[PDB]
Motif scaffolding. Structure first.
Motif, PDB file in Angstrom:
ATOM      1  N   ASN A 101     -36.544  23.369   0.525  1.00  0.00           N
ATOM      2  CA  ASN A 101     -36.266  23.131  -0.905  1.00  0.00           C
ATOM      3  C   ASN A 101     -35.904  24.407  -1.628  1.00  0.00           C
ATOM      4  OD1 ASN A 101     -36.607  20.370  -0.903  1.00  0.00           O
ATOM      5  ND2 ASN A 101     -38.697  20.410  -1.733  1.00  0.00           N
TER       6      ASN A 101
ATOM      7  N   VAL B 270     -32.435  20.369   4.753  1.00  0.00           N
ATOM      8  CA  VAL B 270     -32.822  18.998   4.539  1.00  0.00           C
ATOM      9  C   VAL B 270     -33.891  19.015   3.441  1.00  0.00           C
ATOM     10  CG1 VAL B 270     -33.996  17.016   5.623  1.00  0.00           C
ATOM     11  CG2 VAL B 270     -32.306  18.405   6.908  1.00  0.00           C
ATOM     12  N   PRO B 271     -33.735  18.173   2.397  1.00  0.00           N
ATOM     13  CA  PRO B 271     -34.691  18.181   1.270  1.00  0.00           C
ATOM     14  C   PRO B 271     -35.997  17.480   1.652  1.00  0.00           C
ATOM     15  CG  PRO B 271     -33.124  16.285   1.073  1.00  0.00           C
ATOM     16  CD  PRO B 271     -32.632  17.196   2.206  1.00  0.00           C
ATOM     17  N   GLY B 272     -37.042  17.682   0.864  1.00  0.00           N
ATOM     18  CA  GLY B 272     -38.283  16.909   1.020  1.00  0.00           C
ATOM     19  C   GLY B 272     -38.997  16.880  -0.319  1.00  0.00           C
ATOM     20  N   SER B 273     -40.110  16.152  -0.362  1.00  0.00           N
ATOM     21  CA  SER B 273     -40.930  16.005  -1.537  1.00  0.00           C
ATOM     22  C   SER B 273     -41.548  17.366  -1.912  1.00  0.00           C
ATOM     23  CB  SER B 273     -42.025  14.986  -1.215  1.00  0.00           C
ATOM     24  OG  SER B 273     -43.087  15.079  -2.136  1.00  0.00           O
ATOM     25  N   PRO B 274     -41.667  17.655  -3.222  1.00  0.00           N
ATOM     26  CA  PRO B 274     -42.332  18.885  -3.706  1.00  0.00           C
ATOM     27  C   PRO B 274     -43.727  19.036  -3.155  1.00  0.00           C
ATOM     28  CG  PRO B 274     -41.290  17.785  -5.498  1.00  0.00           C
ATOM     29  CD  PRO B 274     -41.179  16.844  -4.346  1.00  0.00           C
TER      30      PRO B 274
ATOM     31  N   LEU C 132     -27.511  20.962   0.319  1.00  0.00           N
ATOM     32  CA  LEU C 132     -28.470  19.898   0.620  1.00  0.00           C
ATOM     33  C   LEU C 132     -27.827  18.879   1.589  1.00  0.00           C
ATOM     34  CD1 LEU C 132     -30.715  17.901  -1.836  1.00  0.00           C
ATOM     35  CD2 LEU C 132     -29.422  16.781  -0.013  1.00  0.00           C
TER      36      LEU C 132
END
Lengths: 353, 353
Positions: free
Chosen positions: B269, B256-260, B278
Motif C-alpha cells: 500500500n 497488489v493492494p490490501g486492507s489498511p 496498483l
C-alpha cells in the motif's frame, strides 16, 4: 451574518429557480445575461415562445415563492445564496451550483458552513471493517478541524456522521427538509442539528425523495468539500457517483484500498488505478489538502477571482454569486488588483482586466 | 548462439571481476578507461599503490580463473557477458551490471534469457490468499508470453516459480550455483531447469549464501525484468528491497493492494502511495508494459544506443557491453545513424555523434 439579497430579491430567486425549464445552469446564464432575477422573470414568457415552445412555462407567483420561504423558516430552514452566511464557498464554484440552498442548523450555528469539509461516502451494504474505518476516519478528520459532509445514507455515510457529531457534520438531503430518507435516520439527523452541524437541501419542502433525486444530490456532497473519501464501493455503488462528480468539479478523490478478492474493494481499487489518492488514514488526506484548506482573502481566493475576470466587464454581484466568496473579500481583491494597476473600473459597479 | 568474448577474454574477465577491490562498477570503469580486461589487469598493481594502499591487491591467476570457468561447465553453468546468448539485455543496462553471469539451463535452452521478464516478489511469510494470487498472476503472465523471474525464496517467490514452470521461470541465486538457499528449494530449482527455465548467479562456485548476499542479488531480479510486481509485504520485507532497486533502475513497480488493517499490505500500500502502479490482475501489468516489451532493432534499442553516444568516441565493444544489445543489432543502429549523416566514424572501430 452576511446578507447579499434583499427579501424581495430572495423571493425573485425562489420564483426563478422553481420556474418550469429553469435548472441551476439556466439560472446562472439568465442572471449572467439579464443582470437580475427580476429582469430574467419578465423575459421568461417571451423567451419560451421565441424558443419555439407551444405554451407558457409555469412561473411561480410572488405569493407562492414567499409562502415557500416562510414555510421553511417555520421549521428552522434558512434559504441562503452564494456569499451569505450558511452557503459553503466551494459549492458556489460548481457548474450547476444551487442558487438557493436550504440550510437547517441551530439559530447561531450557521457558521459551520464556512469550515473546510471532507466528504466521506461509500457502500450502503458496508462491511464491519469498512464501518469501523469510516467512523475512525471521520473522528480523526473532525479532530483535525474538518467538517464531515455526507448523504445520510445507510452504511458508510451514517457511520461517518455518527463519529463526527461533536466536531461537526453536514448531511445533504435528496428531498425536502421535512421528508427524510432513510426514515430510520430521522433520529440521527436531529442529533446532527443538536450537535451544531447542519442538514442541506436544494429541494422544495414536502418533496419526497425519489430514486432519481439521489444522484443529483451527490454533486452537492462533493461540491461543498475540499476532498471526497470513498471507503468501500462495489461496482455500481452510488458512492462512485459522488467520486465522478468530485473529479468533474476538480476535487481530490481519496480511496481506501482492499484485497483484489474483496467485492467491496472493486470500485475503490479502480478509482486508485484511474488516479485517485490511496489512503490508509486521515493523515494522507490532511497532508494532501494542507496546500489549500474579516475582509482578508484566503488561499485560492485571489486566483479564483482573477479567473472570473476578463476583457468583458462583470458586476461585483456576479463575482460573489459565481465564486461564493464573501462580499468583503471580493472587494479587497478587486482593490488589490486596481491599485496594482491591473483593473479597469467601468460605469455602475462593472469591472474588467 | 552469440559469442562476444574469446576464451582468453572470458578468462581475463573472470580474473578481473574476482580481483580484490574490483566490483561491477569498478569493472565497468576499468574497461571504459583501459579498453580491455587484459589491459586493466596489468595496471591493477600500480593503480592500487598509486592509490595509496599499503600492499598489493589479490589478483587471481590465469589458472585459477580457468579452473573456475571449467568447474562451472562441469555442472552445466555457462558464464556469459552482455551481448551473448544467455545474458538478459535489460540487465546489462543497470549501473552495477554483472560483467559475467553464470547461467544454468538445459543445453539448448539458453534463449529463455532473451524473453521479456516480469519479477514477482513478496513476503517470505505469505498469506494463503497472497500465495494464491502470486500463483495465478505468474501463470497468467506466462500464458501471455512473459518469463517470471524471482529469487527462489519461501512464500511468494516459490508460489510464482511453481505456477510458471511450463511457460518459463528464472531463479536468481544469492550464492553459488551449487549452494542453494533455501535448502528445501533444491527440488524446485531442478524442476525450473527441467522445464526449460534457468538459474542465474554472479557469485563464485561454492559460495554459501550469507545474510548480506540476499539484498545484493535483488538488483538482478529487478535488473533483468521489464517490471517488478510486489504481491504482499509487511514493513521490512526483503521484497521491498527489490522494489527500491527497481525504482533506482527505472523499472515500473506494480503492487497488489490490501486492507489498511492487513499487516502484509502495509509495504505494498505504501509503494502505491509513493507512485507504484496498483494491480489487481495480470492485465494491469500487460497493458502497462505493452509500450515497450536477426539484426533487427527492437523497441527502445535505437534510443538506448543514441543515449550512449556523445561527442567523445566509443568502441562498438563498449556499446555492446554497456547496453546488452546483440552485436548484429548495434551494427544495424550505427549504420542507420551514419548514413542518415548523424554518425562520425573514427580510427579503429570508434564512433561519435
Amino acid at each position: 451574518g452576511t446578507t447579499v439579497l434583499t427579501e424581495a430579491q430572495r423571493i425573485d430567486w425562489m420564483r426563478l429557480i422553481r420556474a418550469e425549464n429553469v435548472g441551476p445552469r439556466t439560472f446562472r446564464s439568465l442572471i449572467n445575461h439579464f443582470g437580475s432575477a427580476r429582469a430574467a422573470l419578465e423575459r421568461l414568457p417571451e423567451l419560451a415562445r421565441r424558443g419555439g415552445a407551444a405554451r407558457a412555462g409555469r412561473i411561480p407567483s410572488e405569493d407562492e415563492a414567499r409562502r415557500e420561504i416562510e414555510a421553511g423558516r417555520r421549521i428552522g430552514v434558512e434559504l441562503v445564496a452564494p456569499g451569505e452566511t450558511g452557503y459553503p464557498t466551494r459549492l458556489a464554484t460548481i457548474d450547476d451550483a444551487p442558487p438557493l440552498l436550504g440550510v437547517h442548523a441551530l439559530p447561531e450555528a450557521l457558521a459551520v458552513m464556512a469550515r473546510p469539509m471532507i466528504a466521506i461516502v461509500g457502500s450502503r451494504n458496508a462491511s464491519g471493517a469498512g464501518l469501523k474505518f469510516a467512523g475512525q476516519l471521520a473522528a480523526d478528520l473532525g479532530a483535525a478541524g474538518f467538517v464531515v459532509i455526507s448523504g445520510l445514507a445507510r452504511g458508510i455515510d451514517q457511520a461517518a456522521h455518527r463519529a463526527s457529531l461533536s466536531s461537526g457534520t453536514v448531511a445533504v438531503l435528496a428531498g425536502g427538509h421535512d421528508k427524510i430518507y432513510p426514515a430510520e435516520h430521522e433520529d440521527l439527523l436531529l442529533d446532527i442539528i443538536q450537535t451544531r452541524g447542519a442538514a442541506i437541501s436544494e429541494m422544495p419542502l414536502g418533496h419526497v425523495p425519489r430514486g432519481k433525486d439521489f444522484p443529483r444530490r451527490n454533486r452537492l456532497i462533493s461540491g461543498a468539500s475540499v476532498g471526497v473519501a470513498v471507503i468501500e464501493a462495489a461496482y455500481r455503488s452510488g458512492s462512485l457517483i459522488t467520486a465522478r462528480r468530485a473529479a468533474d468539479q476538480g476535487r481530490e478523490v481519496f480511496a481506501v484500498p482492499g484485497s483484489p478478492l474483496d467485492p467491496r474493494a472493486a470500485g475503490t481499487n479502480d478509482l486508485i488505478k484511474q488516479g485517485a489518492t490511496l489512503i490508509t488514514s486521515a493523515s494522507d488526506i490532511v497532508e494532501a489538502v494542507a496546500s489549500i484548506l474579516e475582509g482578508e482573502p484566503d488561499t485560492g481566493d485571489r486566483t479564483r477571482i482573477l479567473a472570473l475576470l476578463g476583457p468583458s466587464p462583470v458586476g461585483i454581484d456576479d463575482l460573489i454569486r459565481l465564486s461564493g466568496i464573501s462580499p468583503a473579500v471580493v472587494r479587497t481583491i478587486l482593490l488589490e488588483l486596481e491599485l496594482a494597476g491591473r483593473l479597469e473600473r467601468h460605469g455602475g459597479s462593472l469591472v474588467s482586466l
